[PDB]
């Protein structure tokens with residue numbers, strides 16, 4: 001019963017959505033506000049690596065950086081988007097963050113398995129892939145739907161003067177319906193990783 | 194004038210059809226509601242067909258007062274089969290919560306001075322205060338990491354870990370690492386086991402062991418396995434302290450249990466049993482009321498501002514002497530009572546009557562189990578005008594009995610109060626509590642009464 005965000009829309013619904021999203025997501029003015037938040041996180045990343053690095057006699061650290069990079073993008077995104085700092089740079093992955101990387105992976109995998117046949121074949125030829133596909137999006141939606149509940153409640157009580165992320169500007173303007181803000185808020189939260 | 198015990202209205206139900214309803218559903222989560230809607234329809238008092246055994250359910254302060262007059266020297270409450278059974282299966286002694294008679298009284302009189310005595314509270318408050326402070330400091334470090342300077346979360350986990358941290362410090366002088374860090378596997382196992390233990394208590398306590406023996410044999414296995422992990426959390430705690438105090442006696446204060454050990458007026462086995470009850474007993478019963486309070490404050494901004502104002506007022510004097518929190522925060526003490534009026538953790542008081550007595554003008558025969566139902570008592574519109582309204586001032590003036598009464602009334606009462614009192618104190622001086630969730634939280638019975646849902650709270654630092 002959800003609405004589709006811009007990534008999934010065609011026609012006039014799309015344009016109506018997109019034009020209310022540019023100013024706060026894409027514009028040089030938008031950037032000017034969320035870039036210092038992004039920068040803080042990126043500073044934090046390097047600050048955390050350097051600490052771990054200087055603990056070694058050889059002043060180096062050799063690792064798979066994929067895990068920390070993925071958590072970097074989740075942090076910087078959640079900040080820019082939702083004004084929130086999750087503790088995912090220079091600290092372990094949380095079970096929520098890991099469950100979400102995993103769901104996105106499955107979602108994409110299982111996206112490939114369904115994309116290429118019409119619904120009426122996949123229906124009975126691969127029922128367990130639909131069941132799988134939907135469960136990933138359930139997990140995905142739960143995550144992003146967390147962020148929204150948090151900020152939605154926060155904003156019901158005090159409407160800040162300073163900049164606190166992209167979704168705030170969105171809610172505050174209320175140019176878009178709540179369902180629309182939700183759908184797009186989800187796409188950015190899934191898409192930004 | 195006085196009427197025969199059988200003149201009393203009867204509860205409609207069966208001890209048998211409820212056996213099965215529990216058998217089937219693996220619980221009895223609506224008990225409180227069902228009991229409430231039975232008082233509505235039958236008046237302040239009714240008997241239940243236990244099938245020979247006599248039980249009466251009452252809801253009036255009038256009737257609590259009558260019941261205390263009949264507390265003997267050895268007030269009895271019903272033997273709680275599954276819990277006692279675990280003690281006999283493992284040969285451990287019983288604690289004050291499970292003892293009756295002379296053995297009860299011997300234990301109780303040697304536990305009051307260090308667990309409940311206001312002298313004791315004066316020694317352990319300042320420790321409790323430290324955990325309460327550590328809790329708001331932790332919250333405020335996180336809150337201030339967010340741009341809107343607020344955190345919106347489910348607090349239940351961290352509330353539960355507070356009551357473990359504080360209890361353990363009050364009790365053992367041990368500061369586990371549990372506030373402003375993550376739950377341990379020892380923590381989550383303990384909480385899990387406590388919950389399982391309550392759950393199974395319900396599944397077993399409504400039918401005799403002869404029946405449950407073969408009706409739910411693995412529910413018994415579940416209960417014991419739960420206790421096993423509970424008695425292993427507690428024993429670990431005691432073995433630590435017992436071996437410290439064998440090697441030297443401190444001259445300063447270092448806990449409720451230590452005082453007991455140093456005095457050795459009770460045998461090691463007796464101390465062991467009681468510490469167990471105190472360790473298991475000081476977690477869920479403190480944490481739920483505390484949670485419930487945060488929620489009523491969250492949904493009564495006005496009552497919260499009064500409380501904060503009186504906590505900013507008392508702020509400097511209290512940090513200077515934490516032991517003063519009891520006398521500088523009466524409005525907050527009241528809110529607690531108000532929380533418990535509405536959300537009484539222990540649903541019932543109960544007495545197996547030593548003497549004939551007369552309630553609501555019926556004859557009550559000796560050896561009758563009289564249960565008092567607090568959910569109804571405190572929701573009795575006629576005694577608490579606008580009962581559905583959260584109003585601490587109500588208590589500023591026998592209507593407050595959620596810890597019980599007489600010699601038997603909760604031994605952890607003053608510890609429970611201090612832990613809730615100090616946490617709220619520090620949350621209020623640092624944060625505004627907020628929710629959009631203004632609709633009532635459905636309570637639920639598994640041995641204790643507890644929120645079924647956990648509301649999403651926002652903590653905004655000022």
Ligand code: HEM
Pocket residue numbers: 270289290291301470471472474475476478479482533537538539541542543595596597598600601602603604605606608609
């Ligand atoms: C809000 C918190 C609490 C509430 C509402 C509560 C409630 C009660 C109630 C209703 C009783 C029945 C007493 C009677 O029948 O007269 C009781 C007894 C008891 N409680 Fe609590 N309790 C709380 C917290 C605690 C804590 C924190 C501890 C441990 C430190 C504890 C340990 C005990 C013990 C050992 C008894 C048995 C006392 C006896 O039979 O003499 N309780 N409590």
Ligand SMILES: N#Cc1ccc([C@H]2CCCc3cncn32)cc1
Pocket residue numbers: 007186187188190191192
């Ligand atoms: N919902 C959603 C959602 C999840 C991931 C994306 C990602 C992955 C697909 C290609 C792409 C372009 N821009 C972002 N994306 C886009 C949307």
Ligand SMILES: N#Cc1ccc([C@H]2CCCc3cncn32)cc1
Pocket residue numbers: 290469470471473474475478539603605640641
């Ligand atoms: N052992 C034990 C034990 C565990 C939990 C409790 C709790 C739950 C039952 C009602 C109550 C009153 N005071 C504390 N409690 C009491 C004893």
